[PDB]
RNA sequence: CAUCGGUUUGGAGCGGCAGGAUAAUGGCGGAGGAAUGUGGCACGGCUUCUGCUGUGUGUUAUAGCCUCUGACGAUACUGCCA
RNA sequence: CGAUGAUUUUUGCCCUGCACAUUUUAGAUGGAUACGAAUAAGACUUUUUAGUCGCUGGACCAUAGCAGGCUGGCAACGGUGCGCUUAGCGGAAAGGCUUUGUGCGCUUGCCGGCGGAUAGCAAUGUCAACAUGCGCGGGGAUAAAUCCUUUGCAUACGACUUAG
């Protein structure tokens, strides 16, 4: 028999499985599409969520009842010290998708990013990138050869940059290293830009302007194992129900003689990877500004 | 009819099911087959008809868990692979070995770009279909249902054909020089005797 | 001018020389249908055959009337000397060379290899200086 | 029935040079050149002389024979397109709201911009096909002239303009507003 | 001298079988280059060897042979029926056999 | 089928009342003489008060073609049964033997009318001597002067499964 | 491996004989006829008449065909060979 | 499935030239012998008029020598194998395709001299590429992870983010 009354489904089937993210660092699934006519520029930046605040703002929206009138709005502060460029990756177009061809690194990597490559840094000889650092010996033609290979074959160029987490109040000493795609200009222009920025800091004001709409990639707040009532927003059963009420009463019809993937079940809630779009930039603050 | 170490088939202009049946019998009988340019394969019937058929195929999925159901592959090589695998007892060890004897590709990747590709006349569209009938190119059917790398393959196929044309121009030049050398040694004692033997 | 590229087909017409069984020559004397013709020749039996069972050759026996009997076909075939015209083409020559190769013995194949070695020596010598 | 043979004869005027190779027709005349691919049809061509071309279908069934005079007509339209041109005239039909039609140029492209159609605030834009010329007639009030060498392109631009001005949610027997093709002729009058 | 072969290449294709029941006592063999029963009748009575390798050495050799003979043709495309002293194991479907030129009648 | 034309002659069994009954002849297109004599009795009981039990077969003879290598046009008059009724029709065929036109007829009514051998009566087979006797356009188109036609798109049969050269269809 | 005996599957198998409309054809000869009319002839459109060609005429000419037939000679098909 | 960092001061690890012995084989036994495109079309020559090619690979290359031995001569200055060596191209899975010079062989292009037996009238009558191990020889480099304590951006326990 049909439902006696209609109701929408509880929750979205487009965010399955409701499992923990594989990594805590949110990964850019898709980068902005590259336009050659634009200047060479980064397409992403890494920051740390500091907290939320409140602002007051005059609204400029003609036809609104709040037009030219003050609004009080919630805002989020993202601590973003400049990122350091340490590498560059070339990607090749193949009938099976993008494939990384070569990764070229900078000569000197700071300790905070070399800790990224260790589970037990304090017990180590800290040998990472020492032979590679020797590859720069007095002519650095190996590095130039790899860069020429990237220029010759790569269609997508991404830089390798890490956060300067020592400038944040966090007690963690590992930097966060991510690939940020370079858009604009030819492939040769991108490779030259990446090389000239090795061991240099890149600030947010070179990536984001004020009034921009930007997207946020992050792993949400973890809540652990959760029942269906709060995981999926299902209706609580009556007070007098035997064996409890924070359940889904019917988890399936007799046929299919299986539990369907579309039924709400208890499981891990939160700590999901999300891509959230259209967040307006109210302020790109400067660390040196005392106001 | 010779037993070959590998038979590399140029899949351009071949009807999907006829090539699939021939390749199935070939790999069951212990012959290694490579099919290249699966994006240039053909199915009889107009494009819309075959697209409707593929959408009928897409309808089919396990109700209680979509991850268990049929896995609808969109690449042209995988469409040919599904056609072939339907003609193989793939759930036995012998069918599994026979399927290990087979490789299917879009384009002509290495090392087969410098090898000999043959055709299969019993499965060629220009030789099988009545000259007025409509047909589909599997490359267009694949793009219409989700295959993402059509334009990548054609960019790489144009690069391969430019290189393959340089090969042929060089090979043609050395054939012309060798023919001029064989003309000089004609009407010689060895050449006259070889003409009486049929050579 | 217009410069229209025209087809160079072989036509089903009275006077076409055809191969039958890939061995023997015959000529079309009258058309039955799209699929069938009546063929005749000096060394073949006058018969109704399907065009799928025969191959049209590039040779036409000129001025052969439709429905000609065996005597007329034989006389005009001898006059036009169709056998010599056929035997002078690369098609008939390749057929003859295939037959001749198929009649070789093991000793003759050995001799073919030896003579090929000699001719290849001469050919490479000529090729390296030209 | 499989008709044994069916033929059609092109007629080539004095200044025109048809040129066919592998079912790719290239017609050249005083007014320019037009090309057409006919690879979707099984036809053969024979040049009878410089003024006639034979178009033949061998052993063709009813539909494949039907596709023969259409080949003839398409090549004839190409021939008359490079020696006389094509001209479609469109009349602006409105009861109350005048239709404001302009030939604008945005992004380096020519467009026909229809405004105020039935009083709507919407601005209709129709891309002008390559090789097609639009003009607002001076000799006639509320007339648009669509001209060009290719009949197909000219008629398709005229159809685009006519179709974009369709009336919705009204009795179109009563609301007869629109832009309609009134005359289909040639640039060079005959 | 690059070639030393004195046998015709063959393949073990199948057993004699209906749709569901197989007969291991008869093997179906594809002789290379044979495409008609007229071609295959040259090979009737010829001896067939299946040569394979085994773990244990017998008299210093790890190569063992199962011998057979061609008995009759099969079908219309030049396959033959063979009869081996010990039935060919089913794992050899698609494996190559050797069609010997003896007993010779040339 | 693969047919022959037979002359079958039969009569009623003589009685003391009628000691020389009339001899009746039929032209039968049958694969063999067993079906030729069977078809004869089938049509006589459609026309005369006779049976195989009360009759007698007098002669069965093959009628060979008079000019088996002369191309003719035949008109065949038919009476066939469809799924709904019984119909008369007339059709024309080009062939060198009278038997081969009847064989084409049986294939043709099988193909165009789903008419089986059992559903067909051959009323008459006539060789059309004059070109004006030809009524049907599908055989009249082969009686034009200086008839030529090519055979475009030739498909060549290969002995091997794989071919090392590009396919062609010239001819 | 050879030879034998029993059973059996074949060969591009070969030869002899018989029957039929004592095959029908075909080839040769004779007689008659016509057209999807060859040459010729008479008008034409493009050809320095470059298989030029079209339409008329008529009956073998600078091609042939159809029908009837006379004396031979084969083959197909179906059987038989102890 | 890819890129990249570091890879044990242990007698352990990596690369490499051999030498020997082993395990395995979905099945070596001259060569997987490379345009593209059309098919009511392709390719030659004159002329764009015309003629010619195909009508299958029963092709092409390779193929003679104790599974191919030992020696001599003639003719050519070619062919081929291996080793160094020069330069270029190839990123779709390039890991291959060319190329320079040089050295050592062989050469059946032609003509010679010697050898093979007895495995007995057949018995696969054993001749291959991949892998691993073990002895030598030459070079080369000199780590981490887990448990544990800690954290709380995590968490039923595992797991995760941190720090040591």
For residue B120, what are the CA distances in angstroms to B108, B128, B197, D37, F69? 17, 11, 33, 29, 40
Q: How many CB pairs under 8 A join B and D?
A: 3
For residue F61, what are the CA distances in angstroms to F2, F4, F11? 17, 10, 16
Q: Å from B170 (CA) to H98 (C1')?
A: 11
CB atoms D50 and C2 under 8 Å? yes
Residues of chain E by 3-state class (helix, strand, coil), percent to 5 = 10, 55, 35
Q: In what order do the strands lie in the sheet with D178-185?
A: D132-136, D143-148, D86-93, D178-185
Q: Å from A157 (CA) to H153 (C1')?
A: 31
Rounded distance between C-alpha atoms, residue A24 and residue A222, angstroms:
11
CB atoms C123 and B177 under 8 Å? no
CB atoms F162 and B7 under 8 Å? yes
End-to-end CA distance of chain B: 23
Token duo for residue D178: 């629109």
Strand H contact with B32 (CB < 7 A): yes
Q: Over chain D, what HEC string results? A: CCEEEEEEEEECCCCCECCECCCEEEEEECCEEEEEECCCCCCEEEEEECCEEEEEEEEECHHHHHHHHHHHHHHHHHHHHCCCCEEEEEEEECCCCCCEEEEEEECCEEEEEEECHHHCCCCEEEECCCCEEEEECCCCCCEEEEEECCHHHHHHHHHHHHHHCCCCCCCCCCCCCEEEEEEEECCCCC
Nearest chain B alpha carbon to C107: B197
Residues 6+ apart with CB under 8 A from B140: B47
Determine contact, residues C97/B198, Cβ cutoff 8 Å: yes
What is the dihedral sign for C-alpha D93, D97, D103, D109?
negative
Q: CB-based burial of residue D95 (10 Å sphere; 0-12 exposed, 13-18 middle, 19+ buried)?
A: exposed
Q: Which residues of C touch B198 (CB under 8 A)?
A: 97-98, 100-101, 104
**Nucleotide minimizing C1' to CA distance for residue F129:** G66
Rounded distance between C-alpha atoms, residue B8 and residue C117, angstroms:
32
Residues 6+ apart with CB under 8 A from B9: B19, B23, B33, B34, B35, B36, B117, B118, B119, B120, F162
This structure's resolution (Å) is 2.7
Please report which helix (H) or strand (E) contains residue F106, including its range.
Answer: helix F98-112
Which other chains touch chain A, taking contact as 3+ CB pairs less than 8 Å apart? Answer: B
Nearest chain D alpha carbon to B134: D40
Token duo for residue E77: 């495309």
Q: Å from E45 (CA) to G75 (C1')?
A: 39
Strand G contact with F86 (CB < 7 A): no
Residues 6+ apart with CB under 8 A from D12: C2, D18, D50, D51, D52, D53, D79
Residue B19 CA, distance from chain mean position: 8
For residue F49, what are the CA distances in angstroms to F13, F21, F46, F52? 12, 12, 8, 11
Strand G contact with F123 (CB < 7 A): no
Rounded distance between C-alpha atoms, residue C99 and residue D187, angstroms:
69
CB atoms B29 and E13 under 8 Å? yes
What φ, ψ does residue A214 adopt, rounded to 5°? -125, 160
Pairing of strands D3-11, D24-29: unpaired
Which bases of chain H come closer than 7 Å to a protein CB?
1-7, 23-43, 48-60, 62-65, 67-68, 76-79, 90-97, 108-110, 123-128, 142-147, 153-156, 160-164
Partner F contacted by C30 (CB < 8 A): yes
Rounded distance between C-alpha atoms, residue F125 and residue F105, angstroms:
11
Residue D115 CA, distance from chain mean position: 25
Could you tell me if residue F7 is left (phi over 0), alpha (psi between -120 and 50 degrees) or otherwise beta?
A: beta
Rounded to a whole number, what is the distance in Å from the CA of B28 to chain A's nearest CA?
28
Residue F105 three-state SS: helix
Token duo for residue A157: 């160029």
DSSP string, chain B: ----S-EEEE-TTBBHHHHHHHHHHHHHTT--EEEE-GGG-EEES-HHHHHHHHHHHHT---SS-TTTS-----SHHHHHHHHHHTTS-TTSHHHHHHHHTEEE-SS--TTGGGS--BB-GGGBHHHHS-TT--EEEHHHHHHHHT---HHHHHHHHHHHHHHHHHHHHHHHHHHHHHHHHHHHTTTSHHHHHHHHTT-
| Angle in degrees, CA B153, B96, B15, rounded to 5 | 45
Rounded distance between C-alpha atoms, residue B8 and residue B113, angstroms:
10
CB atoms D19 and C6 under 8 Å? no
What φ, ψ does residue D110 adopt, rounded to 5°? -85, 140
Pairing of strands D100-106, D86-93: unpaired
């Amino acid at each position: 028999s049909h439902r006696k009354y209609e109701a929408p489904r509880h929750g979205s089937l487009g965010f399955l499985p409701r499992k923990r993210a594989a990594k805590q660092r949110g990964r850019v699934k898709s980068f902005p599409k590259d336009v050659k006519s634009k200047p060479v520029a980064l397409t992403a930046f890494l920051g740390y969520k500091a907290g939320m605040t409140t602002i007051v703002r005059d609204l400029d929206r003609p036809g609104s009842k709040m037009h030219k009138r003050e609004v009080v709005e919630a805002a989020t502060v993202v601590d973003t010290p400049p990122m350091v460029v340490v590498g560059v990756v070339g990607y090749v177009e193949t009938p099976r998708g993008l494939r990384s061809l070569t990764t070229v690194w900078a000569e000197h990597l700071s300790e905070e990013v070399r800790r990224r490559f260790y589970k037990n840094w304090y017990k180590s000889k800290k040998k990472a990138f020492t032979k590679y650092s020797g590859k720069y010996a007095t002519d650095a033609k190996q590095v130039e050869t790899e860069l020429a290979r990237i220029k010759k074959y790569a269609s997508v160029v991404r830089v390798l940059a890490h956060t300067q987490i020592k400038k944040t109040p966090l007690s963690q000493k590992k930097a966060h290293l991510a690939e940020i795609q370079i858009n604009g200009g030819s492939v040769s222009d991108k490779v030259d830009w990446a090389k000239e920025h090795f061991e240099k800091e890149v600030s947010v004001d070179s990536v984001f302007e004020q009034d921009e709409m930007i997207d946020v990639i992050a792993v949400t707040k973890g809540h652990g194992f959760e029942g269906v009532t709060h995981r999926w927003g299902t209706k609580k059963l009556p007070r007098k129900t035997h064996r409890g009420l924070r359940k889904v009463a019917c988890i399936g019809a007799w046929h299919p003689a299986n539990v369907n993937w579309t039924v709400a079940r208890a499981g891990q809630n939160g700590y999901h990877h999300r891509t959230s779009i259209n967040h307006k930039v109210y302020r790109v603050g400067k660390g040196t500004d005392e106001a | 009819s010779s037993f070959e170490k590998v038979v590399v088939i140029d899949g351009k202009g071949h009807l999907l099911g006829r090539l699939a049946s021939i390749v199935s019998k070939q790999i069951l009988n212990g012959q290694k087959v490579v099919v290249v340019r699966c994006e240039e394969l053909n199915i009889s019937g107009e494009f819309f008809r075959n697209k409707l058929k593929y959408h009928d195929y897409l309808r089919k999925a396990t109700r209680y868990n979509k991850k268990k159901g049929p896995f609808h592959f969109r690449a042209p090589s995988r469409i040919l692979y599904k056609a072939i695998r339907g003609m193989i007892p793939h759930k036995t060890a012998r069918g599994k070995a026979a399927l290990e004897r087979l490789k299917v590709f879009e384009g002509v990747p290495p090392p087969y770009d410098k090898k000999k590709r043959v055709v299969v006349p019993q499965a060629l569209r220009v030789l099988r279909l009545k000259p007025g009938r409509k047909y589909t190119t599997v490359g267009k059917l694949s793009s219409a249902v989700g295959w993402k790398y059509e334009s990548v393959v054609e960019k790489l196929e144009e690069k391969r054909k430019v290189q393959s044309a340089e090969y042929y121009a060089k090979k043609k030049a050395l054939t012309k020089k060798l023919n001029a050398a064989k003309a000089s040694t004609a009407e010689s004692e060895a050449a006259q005797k070889l003409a009486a033997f049929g050579y | 001018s217009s410069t229209v590229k025209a087809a160079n087909w072989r036509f089903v017409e009275v006077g076409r020389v055809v191969l039958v069984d890939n061995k023997e020559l015959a000529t079309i004397v009258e058309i039955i249908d799209q699929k069938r013709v009546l063929i005749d020749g000096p060394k073949i039996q006058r018969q109704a055959i399907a065009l799928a069972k025969i191959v049209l050759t590039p040779i036409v026996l000129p001025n052969l009337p439709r429905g000609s009997r065996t005597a007329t076909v034989t006389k005009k075939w001898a006059a036009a000397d169709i056998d010599a015209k056929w035997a002078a083409s690369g098609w008939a020559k390749k057929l003859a060379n295939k037959e001749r190769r198929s009649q070789l013995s093991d000793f003759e194949r050995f001799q073919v290899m030896v003579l090929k070695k000699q001719r290849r020596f001469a050919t490479k010598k000529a090729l390296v200086k030209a | 029935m499989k008709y044994i043979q069916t033929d059609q004869i092109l007629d080539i005027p004095e200044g025109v040079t048809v040129d066919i190779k592998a079912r790719v027709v290239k017609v050249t005349g005083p007014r320019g050149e037009l090309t057409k691919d006919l690879k979707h049809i099984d036809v053969t061509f024979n040049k009878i002389n410089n003024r006639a071309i034979k178009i033949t279908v061998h052993n063709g069934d009813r539909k494949h024979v039907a596709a023969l005079r259409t080949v003839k007509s398409l090549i004839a339209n190409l021939i008359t397109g490079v020696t006389k041109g094509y001209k479609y005239k469109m009349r602006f039909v409105y009861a109350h709201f005048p239709i404001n039609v302009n030939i604008i140029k945005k992004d380096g492209q020519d467009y026909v911009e229809i405004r105020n159609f039935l009083g709507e605030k919407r601005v209709r834009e129709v891309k002008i096909h390559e090789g097609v010329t639009m003009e607002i007639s001076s000799t006639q009030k509320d007339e648009l002239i669509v001209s060009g060498n290719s009949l197909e392109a000219v008629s398709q631009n005229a159809a685009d303009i006519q179709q974009i001005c369709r009336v919705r949610n009204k009795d179109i027997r009563k609301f007869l507003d629109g832009i309609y093709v009134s005359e289909r002729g040639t640039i060079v009058e005959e | 001298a690059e070639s030393h072969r004195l046998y015709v290449k063959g393949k073990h294709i199948s057993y004699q079988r209906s749709k569901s029941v197989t007969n291991p006592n008869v093997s179906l063999i594809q002789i290379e280059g044979v495409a008609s029963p007229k071609d295959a009748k040259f090979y009737l009575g010829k001896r067939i060897a299946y040569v394979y390798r085994a773990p244990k050495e017998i008299r210093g050799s790890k190569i063992r042979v199962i011998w057979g003979k061609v008995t009759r043709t099969h079908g219309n495309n030049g396959l033959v029926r063979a009869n081996f002293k010990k039935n060919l194991p089913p794992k050899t479907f698609g494996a190559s056999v050797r069609i010997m030129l003896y007993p010779s009648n040339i | 089928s693969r047919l022959n034309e037979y002359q079958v002659i039969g009569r009623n069994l003589p009685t003391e009342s009628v000691p020389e009954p009339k001899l009746f002849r039929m032209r039968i297109f049958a694969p063999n003489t067993v079906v030729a004599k069977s078809r004869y009795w089938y049509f006589l009981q459609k026309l005369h008060k006779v049976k195989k039990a009360s009759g007698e077969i007098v002669s069965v003879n093959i009628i060979s073609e008079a000019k088996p290598t002369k191309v003719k046009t035949f008109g065949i008059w038919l009476r066939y049964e469809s799924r709904s009724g019984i119909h008369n029709m007339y059709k024309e065929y080009r062939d060198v033997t009278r038997v081969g036109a009847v064989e084409t007829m049986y294939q043709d009514l099988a193909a165009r009318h789903r008419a089986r051998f059992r559903s067909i009566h051959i009323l008459k087979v006539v060789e059309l001597e004059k070109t004006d006797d030809v009524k049907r356009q599908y055989v009249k188109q082969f009686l034009t002067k200086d008839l030529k036609f090519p055979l475009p798109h030739r498909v060549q049969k290969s002995k091997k499964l794989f071919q090392a050269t590009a396919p062609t269809t010239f001819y």
